Structures are given as C-alpha cells and as structure tokens.
C-alpha cells in the first residue's frame, strides 16, 4: 500500500520507457495499457463460474482504484459565486469533474460491481463442476479452460433458472459497457497520422464497384450488403474500414453519398454487434493524449470483456446441460 502503489505509478511516468529517456508513450497510452494488462492478469484466472477469491477481489478493487483515481483530478475550471455569513458575494473560479467523467466513471464502477456481484451468486455449491483439462474425465475450442461437467440427466430447473437470469443480467452489462466505449471512441480526436494514410478520394478508398453501388440512382443498404461477401469477419472488417475511410474524407451534393455510407455503418453495427475495432478506432487509441478518454475507453473495454468471459462461462454450463438432455430427451 506504499511500495506497491509507488511502483505502479512510477512505472507510468516513465511512459513505458524504462531507460528513462522519455522516448516512451503518452501518460494516456501508458494508462490505457496498464488497465488492459491488469484486467488480463486478474480475469485470466477466472476460468470457472464461481466467485472471485477474496484476495484477487482485493487486488482488483485497490489496483484499479489507483489507475482510475487520476480522473478525480480532471476538471472544468469555471466561474461561480460564494457568499459569506456576513453577506458579501464574491466571485470565484471553481473546479468540477469533467463532463464525460462525472457520469461515466461511476457508471463503469457500477458495472464493475455488477459483474463481481454476479460471480458471487455462485458462492459455495453449484450443480455443475469443473475437471482438470488433462485428466481422464477431461478428455470426454479454448482448450485451456477446465471442461465443465453437469449432472447426468440434466440440471435442476432452479439451477437452469438462475443461469439464464444471470446471463441476461451480464448481457445487459456487456451492452452498457460497449455503449460507453463507442461513445468515448466517437469523441476521440482523429489522429494526424490517420488522415495522412487516407487515399486521394472516395472511389479509391471504396473500390470501383462499391463506389458505383453507393452512387446509384436509388440505394438500399439492405440490398447492398446482401450483394457483398460478408461470409468472414475479416471481410465485414475490411468493408467497415473502407466506408469509415470515405466518411472521414467526404466530411472535409456529396452529403447524400455521405449519409448513405453512415446508414451502412449503423447497419454494420446492428448485424455485427461483435466486431473487432476498426482501423480508425485503433488509430484513435494509438495516438490519443487525453488521459480522461484513455481511461474511459480501456476501462469500458476490459469490462466489456469481463462481461463476455462470464457470458462465455455461463453459456458453457447451459450448452453442457443441453447436451446431457439430448442424450435422452
């Protein structure tokens, strides 16, 4: 709580550059990574659907507080008034937490607590259990996870009941987080290095046939997508990046094609709520210097992925239950 905190904070001022040359990254990028890395270490041990063991919980509670606590000091410096008991009104400047931090950080802490809460509902005895990956019973996707086993002939209905209930709870948590993430990302500045990577114009970025489709007389984003090869997640990714590239260009008449493209973007989000982040997203995070947004984005990201771990770990039990029932009726 001294020699422990000290290290973490100091490693951050070096900005990753342990030579001390300050050829490191921004204080923001250093914070984004620190959070990412911490969540991976803690969440990586959550391989079973059971409460997070008391000390891992303590580590998590306190470490993240350290990292999140920089946001307490990010302020708006605004004019206000005050009035003494004597009666006099004097003008002062005053300090309030920044707009996008006031509501969002506590929202994310609520989400954090909701997930730790949901794992806690598996305290003690559950009807499902886990086996060693490398035992005999273990050999009976992500191979590193202890195979889950379920009573032969199904799971008690009150057990299945709570499973479905927490999964919905977690799925609403995952969405909540993703919304905040998406929100931070939209407000992060477009890096100078991205605009430079951009092609000369729309057609070049969109490609010949795509550009002709988005510029036809009539346009239907539903027909459009059906026409294209969306078979692999890499392909949707490439399209999203191409469209995104256009929108950036155009936003510098052409508003129709511009509105048309943003219609597709929304559809891409709706038909593919799970996509990895676009070139632009990556670029924004890569170069962002705003430490407030740095924290909002990575915190929302790890929470999204904790939420996913739990959704994943629930879905295992359920799938496993289902298989054991299908072994009869």
């Amino acid at each position: 709580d001294m020699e422990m905190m000290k290290d973490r904070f100091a490693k951050l001022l070096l900005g990753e550059d342990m030579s001390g040359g300050g050829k490191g990254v921004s204080s923001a990028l250093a914070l984004s990574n620190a959070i990412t890395n911490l969540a991976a270490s803690i969440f990586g041990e959550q391989t079973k659907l059971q409460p997070m063991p008391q000390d891992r919980q303590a580590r998590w509670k306190k470490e993240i507080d350290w990292l999140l606590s920089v946001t307490d000091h990010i302020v708006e410096f605004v004019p206000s008034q005050q009035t003494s008991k004597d009666g006099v009104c004097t003008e002062i400047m005053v300090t309030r937490q920044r707009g996008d931090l006031l509501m969002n950080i506590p929202a994310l802490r609520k989400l954090d607590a909701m997930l730790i809460d949901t794992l806690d509902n598996f305290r003690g005895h559950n009807e499902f259990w886990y086996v060693s990956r490398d035992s005999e019973e273990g050999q009976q996707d992500k191979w590193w996870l202890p195979p889950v086993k379920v009573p032969p002939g199904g799971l008690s209905e009150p057990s299945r009941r709570m499973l479905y209930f927490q999964k919905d709870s977690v799925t609403q948590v995952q969405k909540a987080a993703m919304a905040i993430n998406a929100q931070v990302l939209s407000e992060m500045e477009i890096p100078e290095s991205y605009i430079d990577s951009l092609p000369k114009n729309g057609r070049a970025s969109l490609g010949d046939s795509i550009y002709k489709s988005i510029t036809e007389e009539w346009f239907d984003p539903e027909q459009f997508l059906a026409m294209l090869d969306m078979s692999t997640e890499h392909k949707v990714l490439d399209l999203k990046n191409r469209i995104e590239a256009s929108v950036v260009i155009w936003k510098r008449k052409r508003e129709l094609f511009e509105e048309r493209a943003e219609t597709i973007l929304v559809l891409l989000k709706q038909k593919f709520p799970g996509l990895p982040q676009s070139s632009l997203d990556i670029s924004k995070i890569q170069f962002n210097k705003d430490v407030g947004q740095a924290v909002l984005e990575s915190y929302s990201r790890i929470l999204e992925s904790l939420a996913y771990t739990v959704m994943s770990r629930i879905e295992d039990v359920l799938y496993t239950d289902t298989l054991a029932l299908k072994q009869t009726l």
Binding site: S19, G24, N37, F43, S135, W143, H234, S305
Partner: protein, 167 residues
C-alpha cells in the same frame, strides 16, 4: 531506431511468464528498454497479448506497428500447436502480413518429463522435428524451444526477434 515486439498465441502457453522471465499475480506491463545491437543502440518495446485468446476486442493495439511477432505454443499441448496455423496465422496475415514471425515452443522443461506426462495424460509432447514442420508451414523465420523456469533459449528468442526486426 525503435522495435515493437509482440508475443502472440493461445492461453496457458506461458506468454506472460516468458516475458517476466526475460525481463525480471502474473502481470506484464508494456516494457521498453535500450539494448545495444552489433554497434548502435535500439529501443525495444515488448508487448504481452495475455487475454486476447479469450476475447479479441480486449487488445486493439496488439498488431499495429509491430516489427516482429513471437508466435508461441506449448510443447505439451497439441491444441496450442494446431491453433498456430488454424487461428493465429490468419490473424497476423490479415493485420500485418510481411511482418517477421519467430516460432517459440514453451515448457521445454516439461516436454520429455516422463513423470509429468503420466500424471497429466491429456498433455502431449511435441517433438523438435514437429516444431520445425510448423516453422516451415507458417513461414516463421526461426524455431526455438524454451523454458521460463529454466531460462533456456529465452534470450535466444528475443535476440532473434531483435535481429530479424532490423532487416
């Protein structure tokens, strides 16, 4: 000069332990230090990918501006071996084609441990020859077998990454 070096591969392969090993509750923060190579000094940036295997959206920066990748599998997990070609190669070849790869086979101390293999029947030992097939298959620049416990070839790994990323 600046090098970004990224360790990639499955879970329970020892990604983070390898890095903690090389440099110094398993936590590896992004690390950067000066090293001298054959004359002049380069700045080495090491990246952990822990957790990505579980949820891809966790680590957006993993592949960006990478100079060299260390693809790692466990010598006692055939699934981790299969995934190098089934899962990890398609990713690097999508986000960063033409960035050099170094094949790393971890848990070298456990590979011929007759006792351990008997105790964990599910675990299965990959031979060097088998790792070389895998090297030539994924077009890796070099295949090395190492151990975080022992520290064998660990420096050889990063020495290779360093050297290859300056070609």
């Amino acid at each position: 000069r600046f090098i970004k070096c990224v360790t990639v591969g499955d879970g329970a392969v020892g990604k983070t332990c390898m890095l903690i090993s090389y440099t110094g509750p398993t936590v590896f923060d992004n690390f950067s230090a000066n090293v001298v190579v054959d004359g002049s000094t380069v700045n080495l940036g090491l990246w952990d990918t822990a957790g990505q295997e579980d949820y891809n959206r966790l680590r957006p920066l993993s592949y960006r501006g990478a100079d060299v990748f260390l693809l790692a599998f466990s010598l006692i997990s055939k699934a981790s071996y299969e995934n190098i070609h089934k899962k990890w190669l398609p990713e690097l070849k999508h986000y960063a084609p033409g960035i050099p790869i170094v094949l790393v086979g971890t848990k070298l101390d456990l590979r011929d441990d007759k006792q351990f293999l008997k105790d964990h029947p599910g675990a299965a030992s990959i031979t060097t020859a088998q790792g070389e097939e895998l090297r030539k298959m994924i077009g890796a620049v070099r295949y090395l077998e190492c151990s975080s416990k022992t520290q064998q070839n660990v420096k050889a790994v990063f020495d290779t990454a360093i050297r290859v990323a300056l070609r």
